[PDB]
Amino acid sequence: MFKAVLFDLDGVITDTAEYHFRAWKALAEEIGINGVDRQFNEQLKGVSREDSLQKILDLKVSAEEFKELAKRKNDNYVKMIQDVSPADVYPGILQLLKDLRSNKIKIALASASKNGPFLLERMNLTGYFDAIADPAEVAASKPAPDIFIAAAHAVGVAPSESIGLEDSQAGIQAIKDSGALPIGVGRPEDLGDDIVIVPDTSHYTLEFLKEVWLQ
Ligand SMILES: O=P(O)(O)[C@H](F)[C@@H]1O[C@H](CO)[C@@H](O)[C@H](O)[C@H]1O
Numbered sequence: 457m458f459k460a461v462l463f464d465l466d467g468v469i470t471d472t473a474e475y476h477f478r479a480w481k482a483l484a485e486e487i488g489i490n491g492v493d494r495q496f497n498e499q500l501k502g503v504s505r506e507d508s509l510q511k512i513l514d515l516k517v518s519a520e521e522f523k524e525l526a527k528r529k530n531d532n533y534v535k536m537i538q539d540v541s542p543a544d545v546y547p548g549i550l551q552l553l554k555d556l557r558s559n560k561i562k563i564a565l566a567s568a569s570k571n572g573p574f575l576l577e578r579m580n581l582t583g584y585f586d587a588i589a590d591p592a593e594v595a596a597s598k599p600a601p602d603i604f605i606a607a608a609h610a611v612g613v614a615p616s617e618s619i620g621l622e623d624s625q626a627g628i629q630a631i632k633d634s635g636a637l638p639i640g641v642g643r644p645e646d647l648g649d650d651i652v653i654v655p656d657t658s659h660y661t662l663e664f665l666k667e668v669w670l671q
């Protein structure tokens with residue numbers, strides 16, 4: 457049986473992927489870049505703050521301006537999330553965490569976000585997590601597998617005996633290359649038809665994770 461579940465945060469635990477999108481789009485338009493629409497944003501889901509900004513820019517600025525722009529977007533995003541609360545936890549997620557703990561299955565965060573710990577606190581979820589993989593500690597971020605490897609290590613479980621939950625293209629690839637089993641949430645048109653994909657997080661039940669692990 458799998459022995460850990462490795463959670464992305466934005467777009468898996470709560471709807472903060474939407475706020476990242478809105479914040480990056482606002483930033484891009486301030487600098488005259490209008491190509492950050494929902495489709496383009498699929499390239500920013502799961503991707504580090506600096507890599508995200510660079511993807512937008514590739515659509516040159518000084519190093520000083522680059523630093524200011526990343527900070528500006530983060531400052532806006534951090535304002536946007538101040539009122540996040542337990543009511544914002546996505547359907548199924550709180551019960552999944554409870555069921556995993558009752559069944560002695562480890563729970564680790566594998567989020568790119570420096571805002572992850574703040575968000576877990578806002579949602580009263582910190583106590584469910586056996587570990588939070590600090591994204592600033594890994595040499596490489598998504599789609600590199602490092603963060604999922606680190607999350608699994610932090611709870612003493614092999615990636616091959618873990619399930620990873622993700623809403624992003626980059627993150628699904630990261631899970632695949634870690635050895636963990638991905639279950640994506642979102643549209644197959646965005647996330648592919650080669651792994652198990654559910655349309656919303658109500659489908660993330662321990663029963664279903666078992667159903668998938670067995671198949
Ligand atoms: O919250 P940040 O900026 O530290 C983190 F880098 C963000 O992580 C998201 C995935 O969890 C990305 O989608 C987002 O672009 C990025 O800024």
Ligand SMILES: [Mg+2]
Nearest residue numbers: 464466467623
């Ligand atoms: Mg995500």
